[PDB]
Amino acid sequence: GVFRTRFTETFGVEHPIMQGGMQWVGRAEMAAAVANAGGLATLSALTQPSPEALAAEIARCRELTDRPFGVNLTLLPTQKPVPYAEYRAAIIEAGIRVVETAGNDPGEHIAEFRRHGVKVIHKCTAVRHALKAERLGVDAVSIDGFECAGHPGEDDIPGLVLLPAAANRLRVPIIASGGFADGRGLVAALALGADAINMGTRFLATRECPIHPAVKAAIRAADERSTDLIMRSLRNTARVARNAISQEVLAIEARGGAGYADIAALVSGQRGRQVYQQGDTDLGIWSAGMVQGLIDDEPACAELLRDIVEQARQLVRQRLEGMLAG
Template identity: 85%
Template structure:
């Protein structure tokens, strides 16, 4: 039985207030099923699959590994060529998935269609103003992403310590705190700040069930909280990535000024990032990692990770925080 009962656990029918959000090239059936079986909520990455048909196959494969509830992430990218988002959306609905995490560009069209088919929607955003818009569109929860996060932190540079309570002050739907979470201390802090759950990404990269190359997992454990770069700021498409030779080259190009996406496109190629995870060469391309990598030192199973996290959080509340209360 879960130690923590929150609006998140009740809304999505999971045991723990812990989520594994969408991760390109990482959110595959093995890892999603492991997190799900451990009592969390995890989502497959739709765009890690080359086609809507392949996504339907991956959903079916995940169902072979778990009989619990899992979701799918659909990230709406600012790509130069049209993406078959409607077809991916249809594959999700037709496969019977009941939870979707949206992110990126305006999700209004997709939220309406998902809700029409009884699918619960979590929208991931980087500011309170965008969270309020998502709430108006009818989402069931918001994942609010602080500046510490891996991937895209937005352009406001607001860290979670301020962003989470600010969102809690104004939103009515459940809030999932994202960016900078790896252990029970983070869970307790997020709940105290007004969140209903935490979302972890980088922490799940260094787990036994994650299928990325062992050399990448080792690099995460060896890194500290300073070992990331925020690239593409000049394009107002900021992305926090693991610091490596390629991220440093991107920053050098941006420093020259008057940079267009075409100037760095070959460096930030998603296929090169995929190669990092598959081949283990951490300088092959850009790959996402959050500042929280400085807190990651081991490679547990997902079941052990969630158990340790919840037990640590419970212990902190019972033995540390309650012990600080004075009744005199």
């Protein structure tokens, strides 16, 4: 493609751009659009309610794209127990060649994927977690900074510092994640030591993303200050779109004594998944990054990836080289 990096080489895709795990959203239509657009796409595993349904969704995604795509397997605190090993079995038996893991204690799942020729990208929120993942033999790490939609951990280190700190210590390829939307972010991430960018919020605002048009309009209208950090008091911080629910969750936490039971009904994924289906952005918790303040359009995935790498190339060849010319 336009940029050749350790990422494009390692994972065999045209652009140094990845669409990581997106609960509820990361379905066949999203993954295929990204894969057809030249990026590394992922189907969300836990968006499918059983291993058998994930097998069916992998098959459906293969009807929409001939290009390889990955699966994201997320290992975070769960309301109901999850049979991870069976999901893992389904991913392997389907011939998926790359997996993005995220969350706590990925060790046992990384090893099993390795034993079967499945490359692993592990997403994590601190240099010490990336190093531990590298010791476990992952093929790349995704470094999730404080900007990110979702779970940034509890250190509160933005990518401007976390990426070069990770690059000072890691040897496997690095994917920068959180806060990225355009070619300026891609060049910044490459300069800081990454080999690719991961994006979540930016793909919400694409034509093919299978969510309600009112969610996409909320992202365009939102600025960078319109997210909340919920569950800080439970040390399970999650960055979410500011709405009546997240503001209520914050009000409950500010009273003191709040435990997860006091907010479980507000933060439930079954309320949150209706946001994307019906477009009622106050129905529940939905994930959005502060990068929404850089987003006000709705391109097709193919034009978006092409625009990012072309804009990034022009930043190098015109803006940066122009400052070195005189």
